[PDB]
Ligand binder design. Structure first.
Ligand code: SAH
Ligand code: SAH
Ligand code: MG
Lengths: 223, 211
């Protein structure tokens, strides 16, 4: 899986610059995820994107983060390992079963204490955060869930992220189809095109769309 | 050029997510670069990589940077615009004529005061910095290496002493040929850095100094 010019080039990146520095428990998540899910393992953040997100989190000095869409936990464990010892993550996914595929390796990595996993749909949780008593504020928000709700998440996340914080959207080049379409991915083409147009014109954010993985768009909140 | 599956996909990134947000003086650098250097305009850091570097510098809170390889100044102006008002950039290139193509637009953007442009080969400039004991602890937050590929490993061993612990050295063109193959192996096995290779532009490898 790649949006690059060649699968060989994608493998060069993995072999040269990811797998030799990949945490062993991240490898364990990858192996377990393919064994259970087959091609659906491609739902995971790819390992080169993971390593990038890790250094991004370190460079921003992020400590409080929100993850919408957990699956078996590759990006969640990536995030927990990058954060300092007192980092805290709110991680939302209706599929607790997938989460428990990765949880033994999260536990082995010693970072379970950083994670608040919420088995729920994200819309209601983020609406409760906005409606809750306390001040929810995040350094970083990773949106990697159900694409038809991405614009809805944006309007929630732009209230919950700090000014100067980052909201990151995954899959924003969607197999190249934003410019094309593989028939089974057609349903998600429109919502990603819609999200791309929405972020492109948003004055409250600075953006960079990065041709890593299946496309990552970073949104730095400035208003 | 693009390392993506299709040129249409690359152009989509530019049209949708770069040009509507691109500083007008960066556009003017792009146009003047084609007018003077033609298809060597391709040597410039591409617009999507520009916004990426800009976002990196803002998130890092970078203030002092070093640029090796300037050409007509697209990445240099990108950097100057991302830095705070009191930011400083040291920019090294033997081609002063190319720099002076972009200079009017750097000046119109109001950021010329941030820039110390040095007309030289970078190896000797950096060796002089390493010799300058008195300013050795005046370190850079960010180093961008975008020059002559056969010297990249040499620049690494200089830059790793010039950048702060926790700062970043960024190598351009790491998905290029031999000096890049060698560089990629060298950084992969360097215990003094953490790395991430990003498939943007011609390939960018970020090196965060940890020792
Ligand atoms: N309404 C919703 N709210 C939150 N998550 C949802 C959701 N609907 C679907 N999802 C979840 O979105 C996930 C997308 S895959 C997430 C991949 C993950 N970031 C990783 O690196 O492994 C799926 O696990 C799915 O269960
Ligand atoms: N020994 C050397 N030291 C510093 N720069 C060098 C060099 N040898 C070649 N170069 C320069 O490296 C540059 C590469 S093109 C640089 C692109 C620039 N960052 C931009 O965005 O426009 C050329 O301008 C060339 O003059
Ligand atoms: Mg993903």
């Amino acid at each position: 899986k790649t949006i690059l010019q060649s699968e060989a080039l994608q493998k060069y990146i993995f072999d040269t610059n990811v797998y030799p520095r990949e945490h062993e428990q991240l490898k364990r998540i990858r192996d377990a995820t393919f064994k259970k899910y087959g091609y659906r393992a491609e739902l995971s953040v790819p390992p080169d994107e993971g390593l990038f997100l890790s250094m991004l989190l370190k460079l921003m000095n992020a400590k409080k983060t929100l993850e919408i869409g957990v699956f078996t936990g590759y990006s969640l464990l990536t995030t927990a390992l990058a954060l300092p010892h007192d980092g805290q993550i709110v991680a939302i996914d209706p599929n607790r079963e997938a989460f428990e595929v990765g949880l033994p390796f999260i536990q082995k990595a010693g970072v379970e204490h950083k994670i608040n996993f919420i088995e729920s749909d994200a819309i209601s949780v983020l609406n409760e955060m906005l409606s809750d008593k306390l001040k929810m504020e995040f350094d970083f928000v990773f949106v990697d869930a159900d694409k038809p709700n991405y614009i809805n998440y944006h309007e929630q996340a732009i209230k919950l992220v700090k000014v100067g914080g980052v909201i990151a959207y995954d899959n924003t080049l969607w197999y190249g189809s934003v410019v094309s379409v593989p028939e089974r991915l057609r349903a998600s083409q429109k919502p990603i095109i819609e999200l791309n147009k929405y972020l492109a014109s948003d004055p409250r954010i600075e953006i960079t769309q990065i041709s890593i993985g299946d496309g990552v768009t970073l949104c730095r909140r400035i208003l």
